[PDB]
Design a protein around this ligand. Structure first.
Ligand SMILES: CC(=O)N[C@H]1[C@@H](OP(=O)(O)OP(=O)(O)OC[C@H]2O[C@@H](n3ccc(=O)[nH]c3=O)[C@H](O)[C@@H]2O)O[C@H](CO)[C@@H](O)[C@@H]1O[C@H](C)C(=O)N[C@@H](C)C(=O)O
Ligand SMILES: Nc1ncnc2c1ncn2[C@@H]1O[C@H](COP(=O)(O)OP(=O)(O)O)[C@@H](O)[C@H]1O
Length: 433
């Protein structure tokens, strides 16, 4: 596209807004920038040449614009933006700017949970094939920074927020991995409005990769991945689990370094995207055998005396923990650590996994009582995670799992979920060896 002599206004001064400033300056277009916050985090980083307005939006700036570029952190529904829209001022985001310039195919990944896992893994499959792959987007490297004449494949993790402002994506392959209640402040009309944002990812996609077990991932009007069914699925038989693709065995899950049924379906989704993108199968399968997974994502920290200790500290929401529980095949007793800051979540969806004779809950942190209320008869409540671990550890037996998948933010007691996971891992080594 050509922005020569346009009046461009960028809203938001975080990573996105700055990558947009860089993008326009590199084309000799000088944008203006604003942010509703007085001192947004990217303010320091801004070139001195750039006019800026902080502490509020500048409506006269907005209304005089030829193009408004909106960071994903501000709602299109913002009264200032709907007024620009009503003035017929074009509004786009960074992903839109990106798709107009990109000269290599795009794999596009969205969904409530699993995005970074699946995005990373598709990158690893491309790397294993010797492809110059650009991985970025929501994962944390702003997409505009990936733009590179030598790049042969882009792999973009995309949020609902980014998809809302994007109209030219034509992905060689696109997925919604799953849809569970998230960011609901941004979606006052409820689960279907959140879902509808995500569904845009498929428009003009060459292959849609859908989740056979989650209807919400399907266009209302494909290739599928699934646990029991789908083009890409898992096949458990004679004591083994296999990846199946179009009815063929392609890999024994034992050859992967990932654990957890939902990580195996992530592996299937990634494989499906890589196949659609024309990556060689043999190298993609190879990436499945070498990929260790991201830290704190259902991450095995220790297997010893027939007990698996699993750090799923990144599970800060109900949907993540639910996926963890749903895929479990524990021979002995599950010891499940829950709690922290529940962010007013509804924990009911967890309860159906917590029946029968072989589950114990160890609930801690700010909202531990809400989590124990899931099933008080089998729940301990402590102040801290460490206390919970010192209660459960003397009880573990061969065949058991100890799972930290707390369904809650960690911010009431920890710096962040990573500290919580690292603390869990240290205790697990101490108490599990
Ligand atoms: C919330 C969001 O969409 N953030 C993504 C964004 O980061 P960036 O720093 O550009 O964020 P931003 O658009 O400035 O918004 C960040 C925060 O600033 C605030 N904000 C922004 C503009 C403004 O005028 N006033 C204001 O208060 C909003 O509260 C928002 O919460 O662009 C990055 C590159 O594409 C993403 O990695 C990053 O994902 C983070 C990890 C995230 O939390 N994403 C959400 C969507 C998620 O995964 O659930
Ligand atoms: N397909 C999935 N469904 C539900 N939860 C998942 C899935 N894949 C991973 N998770 C869990 O979700 C949390 C975040 O995983 P991650 O790959 O970082 O996703 P995201 O990038 O979408 O935040 C972790 O607890 C992880 O184990």
């Amino acid at each position: 596209a050509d922005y020569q002599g346009k009046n461009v206004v960028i809203i938001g001064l975080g990573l996105t807004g700055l990558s947009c400033v860089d993008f326009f300056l590199a084309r000799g277009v000088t944008p203006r920038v604003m942010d509703t916050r007085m001192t947004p985090p990217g303010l320091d980083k801004l070139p001195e040449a750039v006019e800026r307005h902080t502490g509020s939006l500048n409506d006269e700036w907005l209304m005089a614009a030829d193009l408004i570029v909106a960071s994903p952190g501000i709602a299109l529904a913002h009264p200032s933006l709907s007024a620009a829209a009503d003035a017929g001022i074009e509004i786009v985001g960074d992903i839109e700017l990106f798709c107009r310039e990109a000269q290599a195919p795009i794999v596009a990944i969205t969904g409530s949970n699993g995005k970074s896992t699946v995005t990373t893994l598709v990158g690893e499959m491309a790397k294993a094939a010797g492809v110059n792959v650009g991985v970025g987007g929501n994962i944390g490297l702003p997409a505009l920074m990936l733009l590179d004449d030598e790049c042969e494949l882009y792999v973009l993790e995309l949020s609902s927020f980014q998809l809302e402002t994007t109209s030219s994506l034509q992905a060689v392959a696109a997925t919604i991995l799953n849809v569970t209640e998230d960011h609901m402040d941004r979606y006052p009309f409820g689960l279907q409005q959140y879902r509808a944002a995500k569904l845009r990812i498929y428009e003009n996609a060459k292959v849609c990769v859908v989740n056979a077990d989650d209807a919400l991932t399907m266009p209302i009007r494909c290739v599928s991945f699934g646990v029991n069914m789908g083009d890409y699925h898992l096949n458990h038989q004679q004591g083994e689990t296999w990846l199946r693709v179009k009815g063929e065995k392609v890999l024994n899950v034992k050859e992967m370094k990932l654990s957890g049924q939902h990580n195996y379906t992530n592996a299937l989704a990634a494989l499906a995207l890589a196949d659609a993108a024309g990556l060689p199968r043999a190298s993609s399968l190879k990436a499945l055998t070498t990929f260790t997974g991201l830290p704190h994502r259902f991450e095995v920290v220790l297997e010893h005396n027939g007990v698996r200790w699993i750090n799923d500290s990144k599970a800060t929401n109900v949907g993540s923990t639910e996926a963890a529980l749903n895929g479990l095949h524990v021979d002995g007793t599950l010891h499940l650590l829950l709690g922290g800051d529940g962010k007013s979540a509804d924990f009911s969806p967890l309860a159906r996994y917590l029946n029968g004779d072989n589950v114990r809950l160890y609930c801690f942190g700010r909202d531990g009582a809400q989590l124990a209320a899931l099933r008080p008869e089998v729940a301990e409540q402590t102040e801290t995670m460490e206390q919970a671990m010192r209660l459960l550890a003397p009880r573990v037996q061969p065949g058991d799992m100890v799972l930290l998948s707390p369904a809650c933010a960690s911010l009431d007691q920890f710096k962040n979920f990573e500290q919580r996971g690292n603390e869990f891992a240290r205790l697990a080594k101490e108490l599990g060896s």
